[PDB]
Design a protein around this nucleic acid. Sequence first.
DNA 1: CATCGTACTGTTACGGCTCCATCGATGGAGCCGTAACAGCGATG
Length: 91
Amino acid sequence: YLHDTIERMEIIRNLRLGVFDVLVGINLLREGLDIPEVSLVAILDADKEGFLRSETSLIQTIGRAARNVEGKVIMYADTITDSMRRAIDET
DNA sequence: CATCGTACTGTTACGGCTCCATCGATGGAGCCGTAACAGCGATG
């Protein structure tokens, strides 16, 4: 779980070393937070409107899972929006 | 939450400078007391 960059690099190193298997963050847009071993990312309450749920933010979060050869992105939402439709079409 | 702005203020260690408190003895000479040394006449 992530609550500055000083702790960010330590958390990234711990995740790479296998000390932690999963990571949870309130704002998943900090620079350098991507990892090459991540193969699955989930979006929770994506249907709720918010800045972090915009089309550009969704594309940015989806692009983090492209590092893995078999990386995939899953979504947990019962509703769709125009921004979601555009993001899925582009992907 | 990251980014930006024409050499910043106040309080402590450490080395160098300066002022202030606090702290009988030995040899020479004179004197006294004691020990030591020198220094008529009559007869056979």
